[PDB]
Amino acid sequence: NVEFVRTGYGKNMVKVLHIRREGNHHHIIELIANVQLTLKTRKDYLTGDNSDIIPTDTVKNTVHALAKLKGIKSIESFALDICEHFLTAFNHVTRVKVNIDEVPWKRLEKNGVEHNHAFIHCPEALRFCEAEQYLSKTPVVHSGLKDMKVLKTTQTGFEGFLRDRFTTLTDAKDRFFCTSVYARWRYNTINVAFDAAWKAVKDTVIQKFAGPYDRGEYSPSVQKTLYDTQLLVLDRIPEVEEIEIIMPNQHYFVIDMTKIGLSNKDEVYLPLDNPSGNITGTVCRKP
Amino acid sequence: NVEFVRTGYGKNMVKVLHIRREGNHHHIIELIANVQLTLKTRKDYLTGDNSDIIPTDTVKNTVHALAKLKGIKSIESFALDICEHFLTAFNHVTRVKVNIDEVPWKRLEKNGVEHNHAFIHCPEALRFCEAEQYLSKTPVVHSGLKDMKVLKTTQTGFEGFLRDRFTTLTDAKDRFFCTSVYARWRYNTINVAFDAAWKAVKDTVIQKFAGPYDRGEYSPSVQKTLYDTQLLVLDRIPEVEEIEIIMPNQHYFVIDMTKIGLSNKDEVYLPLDNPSGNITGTVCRKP
Amino acid sequence: NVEFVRTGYGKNMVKVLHIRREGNHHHIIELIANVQLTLKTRKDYLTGDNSDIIPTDTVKNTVHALAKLKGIKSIESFALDICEHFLTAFNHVTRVKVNIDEVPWKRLEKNGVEHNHAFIHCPEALRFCEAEQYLSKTPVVHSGLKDMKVLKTTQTGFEGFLRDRFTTLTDAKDRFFCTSVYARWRYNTINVAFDAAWKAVKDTVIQKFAGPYDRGEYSPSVQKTLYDTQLLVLDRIPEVEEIEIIMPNQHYFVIDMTKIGLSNKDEVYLPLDNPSGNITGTVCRKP
Amino acid sequence: NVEFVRTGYGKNMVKVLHIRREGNHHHIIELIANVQLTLKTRKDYLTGDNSDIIPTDTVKNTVHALAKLKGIKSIESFALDICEHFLTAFNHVTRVKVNIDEVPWKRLEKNGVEHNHAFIHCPEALRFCEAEQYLSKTPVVHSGLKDMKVLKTTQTGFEGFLRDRFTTLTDAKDRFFCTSVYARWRYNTINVAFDAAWKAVKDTVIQKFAGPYDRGEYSPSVQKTLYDTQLLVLDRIPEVEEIEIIMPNQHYFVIDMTKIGLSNKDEVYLPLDNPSGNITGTVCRKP
């Protein structure tokens, strides 16, 4: 024979919007939710016995209901509520994992004035989270951002690297740096101001990336920029225990025009989709 | 036997970023361009004669070159320069059409302070344009916006429609209205303040959709909203001669939970991707 | 001040699958349909009067309904039925347009035996159609194929073209030719064997592109290959009156490796997404 | 303060096509590659020291060069060569992980003869792999298939499930089953006939999904179909050690037409993108 390494089932792509009407003032949150369950029994896989299966339509129905019953403050707490539900409202469930994405609605805003009930879509950075809980254990939550495409046109360089027989790249004291940042962090407590924690992380990444809006900040290696950002998050948000960052390097190359008799000294650039540099890192607090 | 009704060829997906730097204060524009040429001879089609063909690679080189030589003030004027170039540098080109999309870079901004050289991607709406010119004739420019996703949670209704065998819909005094607006307008002259124009059209659409940030504005049929915005655009911008608008109705339905013994008082909603209402309209000035 | 040039509304992305079970042998057709209606009255746009509006939900319901009632033999005939219905079941509808996309289900098959009820998704090319009819007029049908990606590794060249100030490209005796074909043709009668005609066009396109299967056939100009195919379709199918073809030129370049001291003698190629050649043409029968 | 958990960097989306010409017979492989390296030194993150950095542009060139130098027989073998190189041509590299996706070119074929140099795109299923190697250690290869959309119109059901407060679903003896299979397996030796292994796994999955092309095989639970496929994969291919399979449930629901006074007798269906059932599992050989 064989041996199970891992099982799970659930409903994916459960889209939902929750509204809270105050005055004429509406609060809105829309997300796409994915829930996975692990069972104590594997008779479902072994012999096709369905008697312990919560039907995927039902888990769909449950997410909708919990939205009504518990309400939705943040994507994280909702995830935690879904988790706790499947672990306490049932007995044969050993593990539940919720991954949800938030739909980036932004309240319409004419300088300081905010519309009571109109919103526009602004994918600046995309918010997501995950909450995973084992039966009778304290839950684990990750939060993160993705697709934050930022661009700086100077105060970046790359020099003094290893040259080998396959190397053709020449040194550069100045070059574009364009990325689409992805970040994912684990919390040390279930007790966090999630909305606020999130904002802080985001603001940190953009900040160490851009530096002072005046003179900028020179960055000599995206590795070092990446590490410096990690450390800054860990100081500002004590409840973050671990942080992972992915920074693609989406290239803009100066178009050489000598073969057509023009001298293009860094006016016109060719944005190149593929391929792309990729720079990663995951750091945690010394236990 | 047969007859040509229409020919064209060129290069598509020509990406470019043009930068203009004042020391540490940098200005940028990035776009994706498509250009098409029509030739006087069809010997290329009839007999495979390449004697009159301007290679697509040359069209690419040219878009690159003109970006350096002419600079890029707007995606529209860039579009007009490409049209003019191929009609005057050659004798046998009868028509040229350039369709271009702007990559929506936004200068980074915190609390009134704006970064000298850093950008974020937050597409309220995506900008695009077209310029089409025949030999020795005056060129025609269209400009437009797309993928502007907006949501209204109230101040919309839909009642008093026709019932037939297939109608199941009941009257509604109040409901969500969500759309992803697309608009395209033909200018009556090449003499336009393009940046201010495009923004003016956008702001008009958002303002008429949302209404006052105080109370909103009721709309009984999206057709009328569509029509009203058209008229409003024709008042606000004299150089616009014709305007087309497509408004999807991307649906948000109140989830019935009675089958699970809960009463959902318009709190939790189901976003439904497909299908979607589609309401279009095209209006021009009466000569 | 103003004047309508064009109006229309409807429901889009209406997905539907129809099944016809004879023995244990199931026949299936799945499509995504979008229908647009034009009304005699414009009081809906002008004054928010909905009394002539056939609700888009009803348009949705009707497409589901006609499917049961008329059944679905082809997307073209279904499109024609939708047309006929809205024109004959109402009097205030002046125009209806149905554009349909077909989901490329292919019956599962191992060694000549065909599963009675299992299917796999292998979109060699994607099929679509359009039907447009004016009140009490004879309808017009278009059919076409899209996203048919094919590649040749030889028997193509591009020499004897124009050099101008911006040309850098040299003669090429041999090169890859890769495209993603789009074709769209109008029938001169509603009386067509649609499944057979469509297949005929497709086979013509690939055959004139690729064959004979041994040594292939040299083509000196993509313009000419496109054209010869237009003539071959017009010879094989008397009911096609007009045909349009678009062929992107998706580039594969031999990677120059001399700068790293290797000689790449046309072994390793760079597939490049952007930019792309584009070659178009529309010819019709000499009336 | 802190301590590293995981570092890595490289080039992503490296596209490559390798051609091998015999007679008139051309062989082709087109793939897209991702390479990640881990270094012994962390001076790069700590202080922005680049003296140990192999530039991503170099990794791109290395990949290109290796395609020419070593050739490309399978995407797995190419992956292993890239691993091998960076670990042996250098000293400071502690780990390399390469991920490759294959572009599904299929040789064009009519009436028993196969074209010598023409291909068409039929992603029946999409192939991919991963090779990860630590310095001086034995490398690990995973391979997989994805986006295999298969559909059956009968021989599936779902009954005898667990009921709770949020359940509305009723027993169902017969229903459509549409999935888009994803499977990924680890080999216990890097010494494998990859092309055949791949193919066997693929055919096994479509095999067990459809049952006999005559009567099908009744299936009561995708968990069992899932598990059943996993064991047949492990018995037919001794070199796969662990197997992961994910199967979405892309729903096709019978359209109730009674509210418009029709009986839709399991003829017409609504395909639903969202939400989707999801059933996963990972089983391995017991050590």
Residue numbers in the entry:
A (entry chain A), B (entry chain C), C (entry chain D), D (entry chain B): 8 to 294
What do the paper's sentences say?
The crystal structure of DrUox was obtained at 2.8 Å resolution with a continuous electron density from Gly8 to Pro294. The DrUox structure shows the typical T-fold with a homotetramer organized as a dimer of dimers joining head-to-head to form the functional tetramer. Each monomer contains two tandem repeats of the T-fold domain forming an antiparallel β8-sheet with four main α-helices located at the concave side of the sheet. Two monomers assemble into a dimer by a two-fold axis to form a β16α8 barrel. The main dimerization interface is an antiparallel β-sheet formed by the N-terminal (aa 8–20) and C-terminal (aa 282–293) β strands of two subunits. The active sites (four in the tetramer) are located at the dimerization interfaces. In the crystal structure, chains A-C and B-D at the tetramer interface are connected by a disulfide bond involving Cys129, a residue not conserved in Uox sequences. The geometrical parameters of the disulfide, classify it as having a Left-Handed Staple conformation (+LHStaple), a rare bond characterized by a high strain energy. Phenylalanine 216, a residue strictly conserved in Uox alignment, is not part of the tetramer interface, but establishes main chain and side chain interaction with lysine 158 of the tetramer interface. F216 is not directly involved in substrate binding, but is involved in a cluster of hydrophobic interactions with active site residues.
